[PDB]
Amino acid sequence: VIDDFEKLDIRTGTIVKAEEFPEARVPAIKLVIDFGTEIGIKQSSAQITKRYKPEGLINKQVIAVVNFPPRRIAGFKSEVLVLGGIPGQGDVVLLQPDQPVPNGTKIG
Amino acid sequence: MAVIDDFEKLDIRTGTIVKAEEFPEARVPAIKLVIDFGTEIGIKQSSAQITKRYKPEGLINKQVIAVVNFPPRRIAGFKSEVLVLGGIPGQGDVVLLQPDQPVPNGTKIG
C-alpha cells in the first residue's frame, strides 16, 4: 500500500480567497489557495458550507491532493482536492498542520 | 486516472494519542505512540519521527491523522502499525496534521 500512498502528491496550501457558490446545485465554497511558488495558485470547490463561512477561511492553511485530475463544477475548474474528516453526511472538518509550515510542504 | 484509485485504496483516520514515549534507539530518533482509533479499528501503535518539535507529555490527548491500512513496519524492536501523517518542512522536521476541530476517534478522511 506504500506505492499507492507515494503516487499521491499531498501538499499544504493557504486559502487566499473564498466565495459561496450559489450557481452550484450542491452547496459549496469556491477556494483560491496559495500552494507556494512552484505548485502555484490553485482553485477548489469544497463542500464545506456546514461548519465554515468565506470570511473565516481566508489565511487558513489546508491539506490537499494536488495531482488529482481537475473537474469543472458549473463553469468552475476545481483543481485540487482539499482534505477533511467526515463525521457525518455533508459534514467536513478540514485538516490542517498543527502549526504554520511553508506553502507547498509535502505530507508524508 | 490511477491517482484517484490510489487514494481510494487508503484508509485514512483520526485517532487520539493516549500514550507517548521517547524512542532514541530508532535509527532516526522517534517517539512511540499508542493511538485510540475508536471502537472498530481499536488501539494502534505508531513510531513517528517527531522529536524536533514535540515532547511525549504534550502529545497525550492530541488528535492525529494516520493511514491505518499501511502494512506494519518494524523499527528497533517496535511494531509501527499505522502511518501518522505530518508536513515535512525540512530535514528531520515534522509538523503533525490534525483536524481543525475535535472529531470522534475513527473519523474517516476524504
Swiss-Prot record, chain A:
Induction: Present in exponentially growing cells (at protein level). Its main location: cytoplasm. Disruption phenotype: Grows normally, reduced secretion of SdpC (formerly YvaY) and another 36 kDa protein. GO terms for biological process: protein transport. One of its GO terms (molecular function) is tRNA binding. Keywords: Chaperone, Cytoplasm, Protein transport, RNA-binding, Translocation, Transport, tRNA-binding. This is Probable chaperone CsaA. The lineage of its organism: Bacteria, Bacillati, Bacillota, Bacilli, Bacillales.
Curated annotation (Swiss-Prot), chain B:
GO terms for cellular component: cytoplasm. GO terms for biological process: protein transport. InterPro entries: CsaA (IPR008231), NA-bd_OB-fold (IPR012340), tRNA-bd_dom (IPR002547), Tyrosine-tRNA_ligase_regulator (IPR051270). CDD domains: tRNA_bind_CsaA. It comes from the Bacteria. It is found in: Cytoplasm. Signal peptide: none annotated. Disruption phenotype: Grows normally, reduced secretion of SdpC (formerly YvaY) and another 36 kDa protein. GO terms for molecular function: tRNA binding. Induction: Present in exponentially growing cells (at protein level). Residues 6-110 form the tRNA-binding domain. Pfam families: tRNA_bind (PF01588). Keywords: Chaperone, Cytoplasm, Protein transport, RNA-binding, Translocation, Transport, tRNA-binding. Can suppress growth and secretion defects in E.coli secA and secB mutants. Probably a molecular chaperone for exported proteins or may act by stabilizing the SecA protein. Homodimer. Probably binds SecA and prePhoB. Probably interacts with proSdpC. This is Probable chaperone CsaA. It comes from Bacillus subtilis (strain 168). The gene is csaA.
